Design a protein around this ligand. Structure first.
Ligand SMILES: [Cl-]
Ligand SMILES: [Cl-]
Ligand code: NA
Ligand code: NA
Length: 193
C-alpha cells in the first residue's frame, strides 16, 4: 500500500479543519443537523490524520536536529486539533437542538466573511460546468463548501463535481461576492470571468 508523505497528511488536515469551521458556521446559520453531523465526522478524520502524522513524524526522526524539526510539525498539528475540536463544539450545539440567540445567525450573515445559500436556476450559465472547470474560489471569490442536491448533501465537493439546475450551493465569501454569485446562479449575469 502506497505510503503518504507527512506533507500530504498535513495538507489534508489543514484543508479539512478549514472546511470544518465553515461547515460548523453553516450548521448554525441553517440550524442543520446533517451539516452538524458532517462536522463531527470530519473531527474523526482529523484525529485519524493526526495519528498518521504522529506515526510518520516519529519514524522520520533519528537524530536530534531531525527530532527538533518534526516537533514543530507536531506542534502545529496540535493547534489544528484544537481548532478542529472547537468546530466540533459548535456543531454539537446544533445537534443538541438548542434555541440559538438570534444574533448568532445575524453575525454569521454580517461578518467580513459570511456563509450564504445560493440557488442555481436552469438558465444559469454555470449549469453543466464542473467545479474543477469553474474553480469558483478563484474566479468569483466565493468558496463552495457544500452542495444540497435534492435530499442529499455533497460536502467539500471536488473538481469532478458538476453543477446542476436546482442545486443549492453553500458558499463562503464576502457579502458582495455572495450577492454576485446569486445573480449568476439566477441567470441575470450571463458572464463569468
Ligand atoms: Cl508530498
Ligand atoms: Cl441540470
Ligand atoms: Na524516530
Ligand atoms: Na434543489
Amino acid at each position: 500500500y502506497e505510503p503518504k508523505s507527512v506533507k500530504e497528511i498535513f495538507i489534508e488536515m489543514k484543508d479539512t479543519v478549514e472546511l470544518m469551521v465553515d461547515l460548523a458556521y453553516a450548521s448554525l446559520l441553517f440550524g442543520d443537523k446533517e451539516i452538524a453531523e458532517e462536522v463531527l465526522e470530519l473531527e474523526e478524520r482529523i484525529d485519524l490524520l493526526n495519528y498518521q502524522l504522529m506515526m510518520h513524524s516519529v519514524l522520520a526522526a533519528r537524530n536530534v536536529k531531525e527530532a527538533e524539526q518534526v516537533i514543530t510539525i507536531l506542534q502545529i498539528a496540535n493547534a489544528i486539533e484544537d481548532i478542529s475540536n472547537a468546530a466540533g463544539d459548535l456543531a454539537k450545539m446544533v445537534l443538541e437542538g438548542v434555541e440559538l440567540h438570534p444574533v448568532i445567525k445575524e453575525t454569521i450573515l454580517e461578518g467580513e466573511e459570511i456563509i450564504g445559500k445560493i440557488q442555481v436556476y436552469p438558465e444559469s450559465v454555470i449549469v453543466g460546468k464542473t467545479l474543477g472547470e469553474l474553480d469558483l474560489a478563484t474566479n468569483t471569490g466565493v468558496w463552495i463548501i457544500a452542495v444540497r442536491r435534492g435530499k442529499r448533501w455533497i460536502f467539500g465537493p471536488n473538481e469532478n463535481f458538476k453543477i446542476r439546475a436546482g442545486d443549492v450551493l453553500i458558499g463562503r465569501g464576502t457579502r458582495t461576492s455572495i450577492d454576485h454569485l446569486k445573480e449568476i446562479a439566477r441567470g441575470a449575469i450571463r458572464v463569468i470571468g
